[PDB]
Design a protein around this ligand. Structure first.
Ligand SMILES: CC(=O)N[C@H]1[C@H]([C@H](O)[C@H](O)CO)O[C@@](O)(C(=O)O)C[C@@H]1O
Ligand SMILES: CC(=O)N[C@H]1[C@H]([C@H](O)[C@H](O)CO)O[C@@](O)(C(=O)O)C[C@@H]1O
Ligand SMILES: [Cl-]
Ligand SMILES: [Cl-]
Lengths: 471, 470
């Protein structure tokens, strides 16, 4: 009814790197594909456990439902700045992934954050730098040149254009060829490699992108075996007011019923320039109705939300306790969308959308039955049998420790009743990603440490319904 | 060389309404049309001199170079909330205009601010309310209903649609017909008038627009005698981050030379939600390249500007001294665009655009030869002999007093060499608008009070080259 842990991504120990040179793994995502393959995603955090540095977006695959796992496949790994004074912050950053498969096209998506070199979400410029320019319908990423105010642009074939629209002899690698696409952003003057547009210190080229928060996507048309080059989806979904825009890591969904069936939903969250991480973190979804081709932002749960008798908006709020951050998303059988959101109330908060995640109902339902120590969670829809349920897993607390699996009945109303709450990992426990495996079995990939392991080792267990019923 | 003043818009005296029941006139705009006509526009501030209340946008015409003047024509006057507890704040507000004529189509444009009922720029809601929604390629204005979270929309024919897209029995007057378009925004159910979508207190109807800052445009195709209904240009130019977006009052320009010849430029300024009016006021222009049909926002002077060693952006800045607000715009013969901006440095701040006002060069030039007491100004291009010059008019100081006309020579590289500084009005002097008349003589419509007049009475004077040259 509950297996022993199988370590999928093993961290080093006692502050040293592991055999592969990697100190740390974080941020699990678990996906069961149509071929019944399991894909386990993670941040490969080479130098340290923090939310920056040299981080690879990696997966392993299991073709026997979680028993054995293949070699690490690197989706994206941007090259470090070799001239960086501090290598700990000396790399363009990718962090936090969401996995989802399109049930129709079979195409698998990994959506993840990107930052240029520096400290990620803790190292964003205090003043806005414009990141994109629309020139005659077409949107181009801007480049800033050493000692100049104007916006250069990256146009077709990566040709750098001057602020007043003349081709230069500078080229950006927009179609990277190297393993894990480490050549992405490389800046050339004709045939000479000069540097990289994602480097921000001790640069050997004239050009850098805006110091901002970006959102990238890579896909696989062969069950996770190979991956496309990164697609920059930021300009489709990020408004000019948004400071940070990033994924709520884990596994996204495709809507299975209602008038929006087929819609891909990816949890994200933003901050604003009024209060940033202190009081503006706000959950929402981005979505696609054309099988991952184009993406749109839905509204935030916090948009026109009533809080302490006054209305807030995600773009302007400064309310620590009204924040909702990383979230996990589930569609019910009655068409509704539930968003379970990390937050600061000490218990679970849940928003409901009736239009397929575009807008959210007036009230956030809180559930004191499920604690929330302010850490990521995952939740999936399950049938048993045929009564409707939701499985949710997160830290039991008091801190990031004692991993719990929670079971709720979904009432024919759309309401939820919490029934059973079962420990699944004693000791350290943080992020996790649940999946349905079939025949009453469920998989979980999660963050844990023991015997001096660096934060974190990512381990996998299976369980069945009998595990869930314990009281 | 300098005529005595002709009062064009007369304010009340001693805190009382004038003979028309108007306490105050503010915010001159002066427009010399193709026909020779002078159009003097103003805020007609009925109840008090403050930046809110019951205000009409009004003009008077002169066909004899300012000697005689016709009757006031009211461009727009939104009706007051008849149920407001405090009438001094109980009206939807129009405030601050910019006039300009298209030299090709001859169309005259009045661009001005609009707020729903309340205290204008001084009563803006702390949190964002989204004002517009795009649905299937179309942008619709949003309505909010008491007790509901979702966005109603004003669609085709003014029919109100529910958050989820059904027609209701409600409709808005989107094509107003009453004098001064005082019916604009009226909320009907069937043929029963219920209230107004611009009303924000003691409402008799279920619906209101977002409490935000809007930009409206009305146009004349008959030398300013009659005017179109207001056109809401906000969604074309206002980004989601902007809090306030409003005009820099006076008279805008059409570019006469260079790659962008024919571009209509209108000075505006924004605030942001980080620091609002304390640290974010930022000049820029909006513009039209198709004769005022569609409008675009240029970048702010403050966008990627270096201030005390550090880059700022108009959307994120919190810097009182690096603010720039109302401005006046001039195109030089070499094609450069100069923007003279009201600021907090004591002297004249000037920005330069090399691309027809879309982006601005890295330095703001300060000219200590011209004092700025933090008050609006106007400035125009003029050819004499013909050498290229700029005339700028504002207050000399130390307060809003002693009006000046300034002459600068514009050098081939666009640098300004200030030649002459001649006083034009003793005591009270605030906003003003300059025009070229022809000989050349030069007109100035300005704010000034004497003899217990309420702020302000708006008076007109002519002056010629030899007055400037003193
Ligand atoms: C992009 C990014 O930084 N993601 C990280 C977030 C954010 O820092 C917080 O959500 C900010 O509130 O949280 C973690 O630090 C955490 O709680 O373990 C890890 C995660 O990778
Ligand atoms: C829309 C509006 O309120 N306009 C008004 C401005 C602004 O309040 C300030 O520029 C804000 O900083 O200032 C005046 O009061 C002024 O200085 O005489 C008059 C003007 O009509
Ligand atoms: Cl570089
Ligand atoms: Cl009403």
């Amino acid at each position: 009814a509950l297996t022993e842990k199988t370590d999928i991504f093993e961290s080093g120990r006692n502050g040293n790197p592991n055999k592969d040179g990697i100190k740390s793994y974080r941020i699990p995502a678990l996906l069961k594909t149509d071929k019944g393959t399991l894909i386990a995603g993670a941040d490969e955090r080479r130098l340290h456990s923090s939310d920056w540095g040299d981080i690879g977006m990696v997966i392993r695959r299991s073709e026997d439902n979680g028993k054995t796992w293949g070699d690490r496949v690197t989706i994206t790994n941007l090259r470090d700045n070799p001239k960086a004074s501090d290598p700990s912050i000396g790399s363009p950053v990718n962090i936090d992934m969401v996995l989802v498969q399109d049930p129709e096209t079979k195409r698998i998506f990994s959506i993840y954050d990107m930052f240029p070199e520096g400290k990620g979400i803790f190292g964003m410029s205090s003043q806005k730098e414009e990141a994109y320019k629309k020139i005659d319908g077409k949107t181009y990423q801007i480049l800033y040149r050493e000692g100049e105010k104007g916006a250069y642009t990256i146009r077709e074939n990566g040709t750098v254009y001057t602020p007043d629209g003349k081709a230069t002899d500078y080229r950006v690698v927009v179609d990277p060829v190297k393993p894990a696409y480490s050549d992405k952003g490389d800046l050339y003057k004709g045939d000479q490699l000069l540097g990289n547009i994602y480097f921000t210190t001790n640069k050997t080229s004239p050009f850098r992108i805006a110091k901002d928060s970006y959102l990238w996507m890579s896909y696989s048309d062969d069950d996770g075996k190979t991956w496309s080059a990164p697609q920059d989806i930021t300009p489709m979904v990020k408004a000019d007011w948004m400071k940070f825009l990033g994924v709520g890591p884990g596994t996204g969904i495709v809507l299975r019923n209602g008038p929006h069936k087929g819609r891909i939903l990816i949890p994200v969250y933003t901050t604003n320039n009024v209060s940033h991480l202190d009081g503006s973190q706000s959950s929402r979804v981005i979505y696609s109705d054309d099988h991952g081709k184009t993406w749109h932002a839905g509204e935030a749960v916090n948009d026109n939300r009533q809080v302490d008798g006054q209305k807030i908006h995600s773009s302007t709020m400064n309310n620590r306790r009204a924040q909702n951050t990383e979230s996990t998303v589930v569609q019910l059988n009655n068409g509704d969308v539930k968003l379970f959101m990390r937050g600061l109330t000490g218990d679970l908060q849940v928003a409901t959308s009736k239009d397929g995640g575009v807008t959210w109902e007036k009230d956030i339902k809180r559930y004191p039955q499920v604690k929330d120590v302010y850490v990521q969670m995952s939740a999936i829809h399950t049938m048993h049998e045929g009564k409707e349920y939701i499985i949710l897993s997160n830290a039991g607390g008091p801190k990031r420790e004692n991993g719990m699996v929670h079971l709720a009945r979904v009432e024919e109303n759309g309401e939820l009743t919490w029934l059973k709450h079962n420990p699944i990992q004693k000791g350290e426990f943080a992020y996790n990603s649940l999946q349905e495996l079939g025949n009453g079995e469920y998989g979980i990939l999660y963050e844990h440490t023991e015997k001096g392991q660096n934060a974190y080792t990512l381990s996998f267990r299976k369980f069945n319904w009998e595990f869930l019923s314990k009281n």
